[PDB]
Design a protein around this ligand. Structure first.
Ligand SMILES: Nc1ncnc2c1ncn2[C@@H]1O[C@H](COP(=O)(O)OP(=O)(O)O)[C@@H](O)[C@H]1O
Length: 319
């Protein structure tokens, strides 16, 4: 049975034609620091690290060695498989990817047990999964916000009319929080605390009623742990520029959109996908600034994997 695979930065999802999302596993590998060989992938990497083997290092590559990709691919593909025969594999790839890179991915996926492999741009996959009328002769717009990248695209008739990718997304919001707290309180927090702040009280604006949070980090004068209280308002200000860039790429993409497709998107609205789109009120902020309806997709995390699975019903286009 044909598969679609979304090798996300943090999470990897495998769709099987008919079964749907069969596999949800961290995009992690475990490597022997002695031989530098991948000894586990995904949940096997997770458990191996959790038993503390020693001589093992945990990496997250998806944040592009050909052999890593091949190894990881071989694991997710065999794990997803009652075996019917070698699978046709659709692989989700970021928008900016180059042709030599696309052939690298295809060849590693073939190496990994695929009978043949095809690539799909992440925003195209997000649009299919979000159920936008991507095959109609009308304009649809998707904003997919991940951890590493924010990809915007206008779609019409099974293709990307125009598209823009920026390296400002989930991780960069965390990092803005870290640098705000460093500048405002001379406290240094790690990434786990920056992530928890963003999730628990983060917002793109209108932070009223979201709440305060107690956090711990390293005082930069003394080097000793310290506890402070942070407010939703401060996190809104800390994320201001991050949000402003996401807004600007949405505007820049409309500005390179043909006037009729721009007209259709303005009637139908912009659809936000990815985990980064769950930032409180990003939809309202983007809507306020573009003068356009914005909505968050129904299943914002599985959109891309579901779109990648659905694109198997149109293998012709990608082949
Ligand atoms: N409730 C939330 N609020 C804000 N950000 C979130 C939330 N849930 C997840 N995220 C962010 O989503 C990102 C991961 O989303 P995902 O779509 O899986 O990324 P990728 O496309 O790279 O796999 C991380 O940056 C994480 O901080």
């Amino acid at each position: 049975k044909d598969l679609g695979i979304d090798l996300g930065t943090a999470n990897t999802l495998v769709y099987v034609k008919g079964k749907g999302i069969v596999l949800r596993e961290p995009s992690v590998v475990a490597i022997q620091r002695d031989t530098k060989q991948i000894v586990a992938v995904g949940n096997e990497a997770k458990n191996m690290i959790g038993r503390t083997p020693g001589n093992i290092v945990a990496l997250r590559p998806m944040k592009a060695d050909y052999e890593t990709t091949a190894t990881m691919m071989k694991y997710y593909i065999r794990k997803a498989i009652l075996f019917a025969g070698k699978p046709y594999v659709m692989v989700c790839v970021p928008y900016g990817i180059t042709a030599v890179e696309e052939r690298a991915v295809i060849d590693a996926t073939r190496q990994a047990g695929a009978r043949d492999a095809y690539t799909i741009e992440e925003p195209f996959a997000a649009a299919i999964g979000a159920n936008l009328p991507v095959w109609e002769p009308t304009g649809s717009m998707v904003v997919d916000i991940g951890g590493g990248t924010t990809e915007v695209a206008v779609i019409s008739l099974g293709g990307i009319v125009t598209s823009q990718s920026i390296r400002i997304a989930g991780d960069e919001m965390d990092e803005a929080i870290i640098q705000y707290i460093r500048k405002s309180y001379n406290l240094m927090i790690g990434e786990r605390t920056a992530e928890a702040i963003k999730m628990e009280i983060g917002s793109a604006g209108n932070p009223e009623g979201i709440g305060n949070m107690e956090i711990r980090g390293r005082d930069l004068l003394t080097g000793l742990p310290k506890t402070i209280e942070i407010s939703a308002e401060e996190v809104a200000e800390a994320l201001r520029d991050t949000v402003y860039a996401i807004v600007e790429s949405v505007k820049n993409t409309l500005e390179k959109t043909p006037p009729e497709l721009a007209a259709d998107i303005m009637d139908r609205g912009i659809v936000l996908t990815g985990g980064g789109a769950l930032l409180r009120n990003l939809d309202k902020v983007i809507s306020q600034e573009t003068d356009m309806p914005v909505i968050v997709a129904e299943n914002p995390l599985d959109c891309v994997a579901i779109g990648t699975g659905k694109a198997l019903d149109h293998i012709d286009l990608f082949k």
